[PDB]
């Protein structure tokens, strides 16, 4: 896994 799930809230 990568850190996309961690950083997803920053893109909303």
């Amino acid at each position: 896994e990568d850190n996309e799930k961690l950083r997803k809230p920053k893109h909303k």
Epitope: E1, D2, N3, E4, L6, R7, K10, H11, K12
Partner: antibody, heavy 118, light 108 residues
């Protein structure tokens, strides 16, 4: 031992495209999002977009949609940014920067200078 | 998007002086503000993250603080080698936005 090695400076013609590269070493390439950042010399820094090499998923700054396309090649641990329809405003230094945790730009490449000119 | 207003735009100080840089966000960004040092020729170097935490190997003379909209960056005693442009950046939400930078210059 994270290292991001960017391609050398280039001239490119107005209206043409140019593809910059960012070769990653010292970590698992698919582990982290990787962004590109534009700097005009002596001026500010602008986030262009981010790509996650595990999935290929991309997120763009709205201002660079239609200008920049981010890709990645797992086999060579290389990130690419292609700039299209080049204009004088695209001449700048471009950095790649790698994320860590939820933080965007922790490890930085050395930068690539693009000069748009015939 | 969120605008980071960085002041002052330049500093002219003597070695050993204290310097404080200020960054104000157009809306709350909690504590997710990063401070970078960019020396001539180089890429930006991360010094402070989450407003107040020193990155690994950053000297003790660099500090930051702030929560919400007002953030400061402090060099307690400026050294000759600290000549650089310093940038704040909000990492709270996309598009991630930087301040315009502060050029630190030395008088001797």
């Amino acid at each position: 031992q994270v290292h991001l090695q960017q391609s050398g400076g280039e001239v490119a013609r107005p209206g043409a495209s140019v593809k910059l590269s960012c070769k990653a070493s010292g970590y698992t390439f698919t582990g982290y999002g990787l962004s590109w950042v534009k700097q005009r010399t002596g001026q500010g820094l602008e986030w262009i977009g981010e790509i996650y090499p595990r999935s290929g998923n991309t997120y763009y700054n709205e201002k660079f949609k239609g200008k920049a396309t981010l890709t990645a090649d797992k086999s060579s641990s290389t990130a690419y940014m292609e700039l299209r329809s080049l204009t004088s405003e695209d001449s700048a230094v471009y950095f790649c920067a790698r994320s860590w945790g939820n933080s965007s730009f922790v490890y930085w490449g050395q930068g690539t200078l693009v000069t748009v000119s015939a | 998007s969120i605008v980071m207003t960085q002041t002052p735009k330049f500093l002219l100080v003597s070695a050993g002086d204290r310097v404080t840089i200020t960054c104000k966000a157009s809306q709350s960004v909690t504590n997710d503000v990063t401070w970078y040092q960019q020396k001539p020729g180089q890429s930006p170097k991360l010094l402070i993250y989450y407003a107040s935490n020193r990155y690994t190997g950053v000297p003790d003379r660099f500090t930051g603080s702030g929560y919400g909209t007002d953030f400061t960056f402090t060099i307690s005693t400026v050294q000759a080698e600290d000549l650089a442009v310093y940038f704040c950046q909000q990492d709270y939400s996309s598009p991630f936005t930087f301040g315009s930078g502060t050029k630190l210059e030395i008088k001797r």
